[PDB]
Design an enzyme around this catalytic site. Sequence first.
Site, mmCIF file in Angstrom:
data_model
loop_
_atom_site.group_PDB
_atom_site.id
_atom_site.type_symbol
_atom_site.label_atom_id
_atom_site.label_comp_id
_atom_site.label_asym_id
_atom_site.label_seq_id
_atom_site.Cartn_x
_atom_site.Cartn_y
_atom_site.Cartn_z
ATOM 1 N N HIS A 1 0.813 -1.215 0.000
ATOM 2 C CA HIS A 1 0.000 0.000 0.000
ATOM 3 C C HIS A 1 0.850 1.270 0.000
ATOM 4 O O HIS A 1 0.412 2.314 -0.488
ATOM 5 C CB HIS A 1 -0.927 0.008 1.216
ATOM 6 C CG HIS A 1 -1.966 -1.066 1.180
ATOM 7 N ND1 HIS A 1 -2.064 -2.043 2.148
ATOM 8 C CD2 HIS A 1 -2.948 -1.323 0.283
ATOM 9 C CE1 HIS A 1 -3.062 -2.857 1.848
ATOM 10 N NE2 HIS A 1 -3.615 -2.440 0.721
ATOM 11 N N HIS B 1 5.219 6.818 6.579
ATOM 12 C CA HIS B 1 5.001 6.294 5.232
ATOM 13 C C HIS B 1 4.574 7.454 4.337
ATOM 14 O O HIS B 1 4.441 8.581 4.817
ATOM 15 C CB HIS B 1 3.914 5.223 5.258
ATOM 16 C CG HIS B 1 2.589 5.734 5.716
ATOM 17 N ND1 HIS B 1 2.216 5.743 7.044
ATOM 18 C CD2 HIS B 1 1.581 6.331 5.036
ATOM 19 C CE1 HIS B 1 1.037 6.336 7.163
ATOM 20 N NE2 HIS B 1 0.629 6.704 5.959
ATOM 21 N N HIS C 1 2.232 8.924 0.615
ATOM 22 C CA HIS C 1 1.149 8.768 -0.369
ATOM 23 C C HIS C 1 1.617 9.632 -1.523
ATOM 24 O O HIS C 1 2.103 10.753 -1.307
ATOM 25 C CB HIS C 1 -0.184 9.292 0.172
ATOM 26 C CG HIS C 1 -0.635 8.604 1.422
ATOM 27 N ND1 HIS C 1 -1.369 7.433 1.410
ATOM 28 C CD2 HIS C 1 -0.397 8.888 2.723
ATOM 29 C CE1 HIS C 1 -1.555 7.025 2.653
ATOM 30 N NE2 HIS C 1 -0.974 7.890 3.468
ATOM 31 N N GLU D 1 -2.904 13.558 0.186
ATOM 32 C CA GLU D 1 -4.224 13.205 0.658
ATOM 33 C C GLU D 1 -4.934 14.499 1.037
ATOM 34 O O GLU D 1 -6.007 14.818 0.505
ATOM 35 C CB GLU D 1 -4.105 12.234 1.827
ATOM 36 C CG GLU D 1 -3.386 10.960 1.403
ATOM 37 C CD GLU D 1 -3.868 9.747 2.151
ATOM 38 O OE1 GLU D 1 -3.780 9.765 3.392
ATOM 39 O OE2 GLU D 1 -4.333 8.776 1.503
ATOM 40 N N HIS E 1 3.430 10.925 6.196
ATOM 41 C CA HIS E 1 2.679 10.766 7.444
ATOM 42 C C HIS E 1 3.547 10.129 8.506
ATOM 43 O O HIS E 1 4.029 9.005 8.331
ATOM 44 C CB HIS E 1 1.455 9.877 7.226
ATOM 45 C CG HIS E 1 0.391 10.540 6.425
ATOM 46 N ND1 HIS E 1 -0.624 9.846 5.794
ATOM 47 C CD2 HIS E 1 0.185 11.851 6.156
ATOM 48 C CE1 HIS E 1 -1.409 10.713 5.165
ATOM 49 N NE2 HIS E 1 -0.935 11.934 5.369
ATOM 50 N N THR F 1 -6.569 7.238 7.174
ATOM 51 C CA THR F 1 -6.980 7.398 5.777
ATOM 52 C C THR F 1 -6.973 6.097 4.978
ATOM 53 O O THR F 1 -7.102 6.122 3.754
ATOM 54 C CB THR F 1 -6.113 8.429 5.025
ATOM 55 O OG1 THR F 1 -4.791 7.907 4.881
ATOM 56 C CG2 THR F 1 -6.080 9.779 5.771
ATOM 57 N N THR F 2 -6.812 4.966 5.663
ATOM 58 C CA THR F 2 -6.863 3.656 5.024
ATOM 59 C C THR F 2 -7.703 2.796 5.961
ATOM 60 O O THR F 2 -7.880 3.121 7.145
ATOM 61 C CB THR F 2 -5.484 2.967 4.923
ATOM 62 O OG1 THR F 2 -4.966 2.763 6.245
ATOM 63 C CG2 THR F 2 -4.496 3.785 4.088
HETATM 64 N N1 LIG Z 1 -2.646 7.109 6.378
HETATM 65 S S1 LIG Z 1 -2.683 7.194 8.009
HETATM 66 O O1 LIG Z 1 -3.997 7.613 8.387
HETATM 67 O O2 LIG Z 1 -1.593 8.012 8.445
HETATM 68 C C1 LIG Z 1 -2.431 5.598 8.689
HETATM 69 C C2 LIG Z 1 -1.710 5.485 9.871
HETATM 70 C C3 LIG Z 1 -1.566 4.248 10.487
HETATM 71 C C4 LIG Z 1 -2.135 3.107 9.929
HETATM 72 C C5 LIG Z 1 -1.704 1.760 10.426
HETATM 73 O O3 LIG Z 1 -0.515 1.574 10.693
HETATM 74 N N2 LIG Z 1 -2.649 0.867 10.755
HETATM 75 C C6 LIG Z 1 -2.360 -0.535 11.133
HETATM 76 C C7 LIG Z 1 -3.040 -0.881 12.460
HETATM 77 N N3 LIG Z 1 -4.477 -0.517 12.461
HETATM 78 C C8 LIG Z 1 -5.421 -1.296 13.010
HETATM 79 O O4 LIG Z 1 -6.599 -0.945 13.066
HETATM 80 C C9 LIG Z 1 -5.020 -2.601 13.642
HETATM 81 C C10 LIG Z 1 -5.087 -2.750 15.023
HETATM 82 C C11 LIG Z 1 -4.913 -4.002 15.603
HETATM 83 C C12 LIG Z 1 -4.648 -5.106 14.800
HETATM 84 C C13 LIG Z 1 -4.562 -4.957 13.422
HETATM 85 C C14 LIG Z 1 -4.755 -3.707 12.842
HETATM 86 CL CL1 LIG Z 1 -4.931 -3.591 11.130
HETATM 87 C C15 LIG Z 1 -4.757 0.869 12.017
HETATM 88 C C16 LIG Z 1 -4.099 1.154 10.666
HETATM 89 C C17 LIG Z 1 -2.874 3.230 8.756
HETATM 90 C C18 LIG Z 1 -3.033 4.468 8.142
HETATM 91 ZN ZN LIG Z 2 -0.992 7.834 5.517
#
Ligand SMILES: NS(=O)(=O)c1ccc(C(=O)N2CCN(C(=O)c3ccccc3Cl)CC2)cc1
Ligand SMILES: [Zn+2]
Length: 259
Positions: A61, A91, A93, A103, A116, A196-197
Amino acid sequence: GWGYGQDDGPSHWHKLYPIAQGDRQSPINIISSQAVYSPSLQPLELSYEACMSLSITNNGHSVQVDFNDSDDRTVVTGGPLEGPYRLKQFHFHWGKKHDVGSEHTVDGKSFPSELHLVHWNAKKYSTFGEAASAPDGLAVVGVFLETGDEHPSMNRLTDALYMVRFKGTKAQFSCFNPKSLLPASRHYWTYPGSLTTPPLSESVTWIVLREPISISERQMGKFRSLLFTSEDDERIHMVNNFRPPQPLKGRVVKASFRA
Ligand SMILES: NS(=O)(=O)c1ccc(C(=O)N2CCN(C(=O)c3ccccc3Cl)CC2)cc1
Ligand SMILES: [Zn+2]
């Protein structure tokens, strides 16, 4: 399940994660003239150590650099935050061309990329995963990237991209200080939002810096050389991995400065 392709992109996420239609979704289009100047806010401090980085990974991603978050050495504090939030990872985008990629947008303008820096409330929650689901769990600092002059510190990162071009690959990435990717100003906009994901949880206090950093078109090209795909799959380049602006729904965007 989800991605940025024609069939699994942002326009369809709401069919799998209904919170995509929530009242505190991110990113947003920041209308500078409508932000509320908030001098009461505390100064924003990004206190980052030089050797807390662990690895660099292509997770299909984005390309992500993970950090040791066992203590409060590398944290963000001040501004809209009540206490420190530990840096977990950063990371990016980006887009296919200069006119798209970020974004968040400012007055309708998009930047070619957005960085981010993802931090979590280790004072209240026991793990990043636990925090990622709570309203006051995460603090994400967003930095816009413009294309222009080469960024010296960025070279160490863009040179490492070759090794993680395929989805699911990673490499050791030691002693990279995220402070090197910050602008010389700490002015920002802040508002309550979401990841945002997927899962799109509304657990993020967004802090979007006013000043963009600049990298060269060559450096930006290294990101566009990454792939959404694995080694033996038909190559699909990782580009346009961004979610577009979402409805503000009455939220108030605060600014640390007067525009
Ligand atoms: N684009 S952003 O809004 O800055 C952003 C920042 C962090 C994350 C990210 O690292 N995760 C991975 C962990 N996330 C979960 O909901 C999670 C919690 C417990 C077990 C597994 C997961 Cl996927 C939230 C999304 C995803 C997106
Ligand atoms: Zn992000």
